[PDB]
């Protein structure tokens, strides 16, 4: 029954970067990166921060919520990854990422 991050669109004014989790467990926040290397760039964090550009379709403060879809210039282009983190200490841990979405 392993959790999956369903990034439905291979490719996508306010763009919408769609994410859906199949499970709540293991518990932990949903984060977005542009790209994936040691240089990847954070775009949203459910756990902490202020992201005036980014906005969420569903109330991520509800325990049972599985919709992690966000409503976010040519500088914006790139591959986006919805990453599910599992709780850790000192830091959370990449659990599963969706396959990626190319913003054009």
């Amino acid at each position: 029954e392993e959790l999956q991050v369903i990034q439905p669109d291979k490719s996508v004014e306010t763009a919408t970067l769609r994410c859906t989790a199949t499970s709540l467990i293991p518990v932990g926040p949903i984060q977005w990166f542009r790209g994936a290397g040691p240089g990847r760039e954070l775009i949203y964090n459910q756990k902490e921060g202020h992201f005036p550009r980014v906005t969420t379709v569903s109330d991520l403060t509800k325990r049972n919520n599985m919709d992690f879809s966000i409503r976010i210039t040519p500088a914006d282009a790139g591959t986006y990854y919805c990453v599910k983190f599992r709780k850790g200490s000192p830091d959370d841990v990449e659990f599963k990422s969706g396959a990626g979405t190319e913003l054009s």
Partner: antibody
Amino acid sequence: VQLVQSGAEVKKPGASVKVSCKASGYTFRGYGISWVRQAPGQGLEWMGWISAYGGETNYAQKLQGRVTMTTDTSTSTAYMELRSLRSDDTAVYYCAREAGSSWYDFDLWGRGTLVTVSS
Amino acid sequence: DIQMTQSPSSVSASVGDRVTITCRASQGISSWLAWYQQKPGKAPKLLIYAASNLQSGVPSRFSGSGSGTDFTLTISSLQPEDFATYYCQQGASFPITFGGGTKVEIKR
């Protein structure tokens, strides 16, 4: 859906205690476990947290060095050891499922274990 | 360490009153604040999480508000079962911290 804790302990100062907590009725590894204690007539004091998935821990500063939390995934059991026991460790010790998505909270609680530390 | 401060420490009220209890965080914890109720001889119980979400089964008598540092738990139309101690708890970061507790007792 429950957490069932071991029985009351009576320890001498300088001794060690280990409290167990068996989970049933849910996927144990999905969640964290925290320990919270309450000395007689007092409030709640958080001791620490452990990931039941990967065993990462975080302990309250005050207890770092004397406390150890572990899990046994094979039996869905959480364990808390506390070492070099003093009088002021006397308290009821609770196990709680930590179940917040991207916050921490404790939605399922054990019934508590009394640990009495004295000469 | 984020210090949680609960006010008042005791509230006295009659069946039917509205009661309001407050918690102040020493710094911003977004809306990651939970409230518990404890009765004598019993483990605490989770009532409200993320400042204002009720846990399933908790009566609508209870509700919660706030963001950043200041938060409130309200109990509308108190019933004999609501007389207890209530704890807040910050859930933004380790170490997890609880407030000192607010006891709600019966005015007579």
